[PDB]
Design a protein around this nucleic acid. Structure first.
Length: 86
DNA sequence: AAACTATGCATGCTCTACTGCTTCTGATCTAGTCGACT
């Protein structure tokens, strides 16, 4: 559960385990030891938990192409990662 | 002629500014360690 939080790794999860935080609520109880990455991950935990579908991938690519063109014309963007693997 | 008073001056003391030199302190750049991510 802890590892699914953006900005929280194995070491941080183990540290929280040894500190007595056994559920997600305790993390939100004290939002002062969480860095920017952890705060962002916890704020939108539910949205990022849902798997990303191909439709979102195509929408993101279409949006990013316009930004890349505006920054500069003639640039190319390629989709890599798991999606490129099918 | 003698006693009292007057001015006059000097030197040490005190303060406030002024300038220049020396030392201390606060702001700004990187190595290492832990952690995050792809």
């Amino acid at each position: 559960l802890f590892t699914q939080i953006f900005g929280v790794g194995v070491k941080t999860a183990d540290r929280w385990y040894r500190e007595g935080l056994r559920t997600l609520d305790d993390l939100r109880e004290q939002p002062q030891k969480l860095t920017q990455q952890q705060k962002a991950g916890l704020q939108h935990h539910q949205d990022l938990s849902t798997p990303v579908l191909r439709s979102d991938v195509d929408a993101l690519q279409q949006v990013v192409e316009e930004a890349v063109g505006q920054a500069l014309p003639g640039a190319t963007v390629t989709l890599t990662g798991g999606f490129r693997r099918g």
